[PDB]
Design a protein around this motif. Structure first.
Motif, PDB file in Angstrom:
ATOM      1  N   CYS A   6      47.278  44.548  92.169  1.00  0.00           N
ATOM      2  CA  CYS A   6      47.372  43.284  92.889  1.00  0.00           C
ATOM      3  C   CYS A   6      46.474  42.230  92.251  1.00  0.00           C
ATOM      4  N   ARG A   7      47.098  41.227  91.647  1.00  0.00           N
ATOM      5  CA  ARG A   7      46.362  40.149  90.996  1.00  0.00           C
ATOM      6  C   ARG A   7      46.511  38.846  91.771  1.00  0.00           C
ATOM      7  N   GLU A  31      47.423  34.172  89.697  1.00  0.00           N
ATOM      8  CA  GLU A  31      47.073  34.896  88.486  1.00  0.00           C
ATOM      9  C   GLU A  31      48.008  34.540  87.341  1.00  0.00           C
ATOM     10  N   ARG A  32      47.438  33.954  86.298  1.00  0.00           N
ATOM     11  CA  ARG A  32      48.203  33.564  85.126  1.00  0.00           C
ATOM     12  C   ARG A  32      48.557  34.787  84.290  1.00  0.00           C
ATOM     13  N   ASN A  33      48.099  35.951  84.739  1.00  0.00           N
ATOM     14  CA  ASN A  33      48.364  37.200  84.036  1.00  0.00           C
ATOM     15  C   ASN A  33      48.806  38.287  85.009  1.00  0.00           C
ATOM     16  N   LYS A  83      49.156  39.357  94.635  1.00  0.00           N
ATOM     17  CA  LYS A  83      50.476  39.718  94.141  1.00  0.00           C
ATOM     18  C   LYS A  83      50.498  41.159  93.642  1.00  0.00           C
ATOM     19  N   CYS A  84      51.678  41.775  93.675  1.00  0.00           N
ATOM     20  CA  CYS A  84      51.834  43.148  93.212  1.00  0.00           C
ATOM     21  C   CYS A  84      52.528  43.175  91.859  1.00  0.00           C
ATOM     22  N   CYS A  85      51.753  43.441  90.820  1.00  0.00           N
ATOM     23  CA  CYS A  85      52.275  43.488  89.467  1.00  0.00           C
ATOM     24  C   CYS A  85      52.231  44.908  88.910  1.00  0.00           C
ATOM     25  N   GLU A  86      52.705  45.068  87.680  1.00  0.00           N
ATOM     26  CA  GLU A  86      52.719  46.369  87.028  1.00  0.00           C
ATOM     27  C   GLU A  86      51.344  47.028  87.108  1.00  0.00           C
TER      28      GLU A  86
END
Length: 42
Positions: free
Chosen positions: A16-17, A21-23, A38-41
């Motif tokens: 979670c970023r 988050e620009r990344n 957010k939930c990212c890889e």
């Protein structure tokens, strides 16, 4: 079609970023506990 609440970012093993988050690699099918994170890889 469900109602929302994707899938606990954990249920799939992700991360979670910061929403701004620009990344952050958008990890579909999965949500977070923070209405601002957010939930990212990874």
């Amino acid at each position: 079609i469900m109602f929302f609440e994707m899938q606990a970012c954990w249920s799939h093993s992700g991360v979670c970023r910061d929403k701004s988050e620009r990344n952050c690699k958008p990890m579909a099918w999965t949500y977070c506990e923070n209405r601002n994170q957010k939930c990212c890889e990874y």
